[PDB]
Write a protein that binds this ligand. Sequence first.
Ligand SMILES: *[C@@](C)(CO)CCOP(=O)(O)OP(=O)(O)O
Ligand SMILES: *[C@@](C)(CO)CCOP(=O)(O)OP(=O)(O)O
Ligand SMILES: [Mg+2]
Ligand SMILES: [Mg+2]
Ligand SMILES: [Mn+2]
Ligand SMILES: [Mn+2]
Lengths: 180, 176
Amino acid sequence: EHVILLNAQGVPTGTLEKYAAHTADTRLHLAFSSWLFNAKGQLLVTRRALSKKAWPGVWTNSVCGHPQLGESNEDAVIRRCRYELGVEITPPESIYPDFRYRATDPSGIVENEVCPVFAARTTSALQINDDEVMDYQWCDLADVLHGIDATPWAFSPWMVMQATNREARKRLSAFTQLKL
Amino acid sequence: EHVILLNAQGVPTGTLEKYAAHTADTRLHLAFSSWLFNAKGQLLVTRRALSKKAWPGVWTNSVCGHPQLGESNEDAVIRRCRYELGVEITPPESIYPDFRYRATDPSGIVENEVCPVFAARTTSALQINDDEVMDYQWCDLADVLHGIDATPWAFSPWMVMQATNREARKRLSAFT
Ligand SMILES: *[C@@](C)(CO)CCOP(=O)(O)OP(=O)(O)O
Ligand SMILES: *[C@@](C)(CO)CCOP(=O)(O)OP(=O)(O)O
Ligand SMILES: [Mg+2]
Ligand SMILES: [Mg+2]
Ligand SMILES: [Mn+2]
Ligand SMILES: [Mn+2]
């Protein structure tokens, strides 16, 4: 795998192997983030595997990843949902297109990303990939937002930032509707 | 270092080496749990090291451990506060003396304990042992209870159960 490198104005300049790209010195690159809801409208929260290079063992939103060369961001969402979670989804909706952030993890690994955010519904059962996700929960969005307000340090920082954006949060709410 | 095996009448029957004791088939043994506050009354929440055999990487109450043969519960707390957090404390106070639980961690490791719970105040600065603790936060007890109440899965199951016991929570709250 690789990442797509971006310059200061967020324009692509090339690619780098994925492991080598995440270090204490991470250059800006492209990513995506997605929030998944089941038919009942519950949000899927996940726990990153202990083997993940960045934020291992941390609770976070449904799925995070890196678009590969030739791939649309929405196609990367679909792929990682299948790879990490075994799960089929509805077409991802853009919910926070201009999200961008930089953060250092507990052992000093940096993430530095232009990271558009999406939401979607699951249309199949989960098949969790233990190489990527060690735990998960279906819950009510409102409860997650209250937890995020009370103890933000217990979640990944990108989860918290995305959840605290007003318009993003409105879309998450929309997805809490029960659907048949 | 060991754990103390307990029968149905809660009597020690023997010991097992501590690491070898915690498996997918963990048998009942003695432990303690402790909640630490500073002089200002802020609660210390800690995140277990990724190397811990049970619930690695998990946010939980201040300090947890295993009393040894012939050791008082209060002395075990003090010992682990020094070992894990390099911190001195006031005499531990009982908060939930009859707590007991069993739970399974994401990789299948079980804790199965008789685990009385205590509270204390720190009387020195932390000095972190990174073999035990990978992160920590000083916060307001009110906010931690709301977090436990809203997203209990973000915390260790034993922390949740202690905090959701009606009397334990009163005494934690009264404590600062
Ligand atoms: C999000 C913002 C987290 O850093 C993008 C990266 O997610 P990761 O899950 O860490 O990347 P992948 O390993 O490609 O899945
Ligand atoms: C607490 C309730 C966890 O089950 C008792 C044991 O805590 P640990 O922190 O895991 O024990 P030690 O490694 O002895 O410190
Ligand atoms: Mg990922
Ligand atoms: Mg301990
Ligand atoms: Mn990245
Ligand atoms: Mn134990």
